[PDB]
Symmetry: C6
């Protein structure tokens, strides 16, 4: 089966349900759900990771990225370091997350 | 399906159309109900319908017209303001218009 | 579609064609009725039809040919000037032409 | 009917038969033929212009351009000035011509 | 398709998939047989099959993940090193990973 | 349909394939008959067939692999040399390889 993880972002961009979660480009999981937290109004992503990937630290990072230039958006799981480190279990939360870039802001940067 | 109405005036709506999605942090929370030029000012007035369960939106919140991906569809990004709450029929004052390719090129070049 | 006719001469119309939309602030308020080179000046004269309900457009208003998105179709942006009102058969003197990629590249490089 | 004009380029790029010839973006003619001159190995373009466009000077220019960013290639006819000036007739040649840009050279410029 | 097996570990395979082409100087000489994360290191290990007639590839050779055109599919470019020959079951140590757009933009901007 | 054969070795042919067009000044004058890695050098050897009526091509001429438009197909541009003539079976020494996106990005960035 699979085990559940939670990750909150400021902006998920083009992320949707059944979006792939990948390590080093290799798909190891899928985005199960996306829901705005009622108090913080921040996108909370519920992901399901294949059970055979057990040794993922809680220091690991999630970055929302895009395949190619115009392709679909996905979650890149950067394997964390192993200082007391704890492995991610079912129902745990990945604290270190990077949000999706916004074209207008990137242009805002490049121009101004 | 229950919703409350909000109004937002822009200088340029760009590719915005009816049923365009209104999203917070990329998550769709509403839809563009109508778009109409104000009879007096000739400025685009956008009429939005927001899902009722998203009630706690301050009036300090911002609206920015953006594009999904590089070539995708145009949408309204609702930037949540810091913490008066917006009710049915209220107006969001702080709005950002849609980018214009010619103007961006005009900026980059000249 | 009750409309009134307007004329606008450009140096270059670019991708403009018949039935091209004329928009104010992104809101379509009219259509490109015809495009024809003036017999005397060999400059593109564009014949536009604007919806009758948008009457209060001053003659100080401008027309700029722009593109929807990056690769989309070309359209006429009518910039409403500040304030004589434009009537049926009048001519918009102030026009901005369509950009040419080769020239943009020529600029960017040289 | 139509009248014929000839224009030699160094490189025609994506130009082909039945390609549009336009003034100020308005199509006024079509590319009838393209053939390499046997001695000079330069692309010679034979164009046909609608008869009703009579007052085109021989000082006019032809530039091969592209519609949009990825669209098809066409001939932009820049109306010449009217100094003894002669109008273009059937079988005449447009001397002032600009060739089609090459992506590799443009990149070569931008980089080096 | 008589072939011999090779292994190559990357930090990121990007768009690489099964049946992805392995090419020398643009000429396809093999195929990506499999891709699997090493159980111990959690790093992508790519299993390649190279056509038997290309035997004289030294072990100093390099693998770089590249893209055909601008938007095309991703492939493995095998750069033949100058001159021990690679056999069936060997491992290419020298590998260059697939670029990430976000990082490229991050570089270009910052 | 009559043709004479020419050979050209590159470091990288890129997207070149069989039946790729060989053009002078954009005008197609020949086709890529075959592509094969040299057994000794592991370098792409391109076998071209040129229409017989284009006989007067000097051996000082150059071959450059280019792309049609921005996203179009890959082709061989034959740059006519200044004024020994190339015959059937001769080899063009001066060749330019196909650009690599990663290398161009590598150049632009680093
Ligand atoms: Zn669970
Ligand atoms: Zn451990
Ligand atoms: Zn309401
Ligand atoms: Zn409150
Ligand atoms: Zn009328
Ligand atoms: Zn008035
Ligand atoms: Zn004739
Ligand atoms: Zn005259
Ligand atoms: Zn094997
Ligand atoms: Zn050896
Ligand atoms: Zn032969
Ligand atoms: Zn000679």
């Amino acid at each position: 089966p699979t085990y559940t993880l939670y990750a909150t972002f400021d902006n998920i961009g083009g992320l949707k349900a059944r979006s792939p979660v990948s390590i080093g480009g290799v798909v190891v999981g899928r985005v199960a759900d996306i829901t705005l937290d009622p108090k913080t109004y921040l996108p909370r992503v519920t992901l399901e990771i294949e059970q055979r990937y057990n040794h993922i630290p809680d220091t690991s990072s999630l970055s929302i990225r895009t395949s190619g230039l115009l392709g679909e958006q996905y979650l890149a799981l950067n394997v964390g370091f192993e200082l007391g480190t704890a492995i991610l279990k079912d129902g745990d939360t990945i604290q270190d997350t990077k949000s999706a870039m916004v074209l207008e802001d990137l242009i805002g940067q490049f121009l101004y």
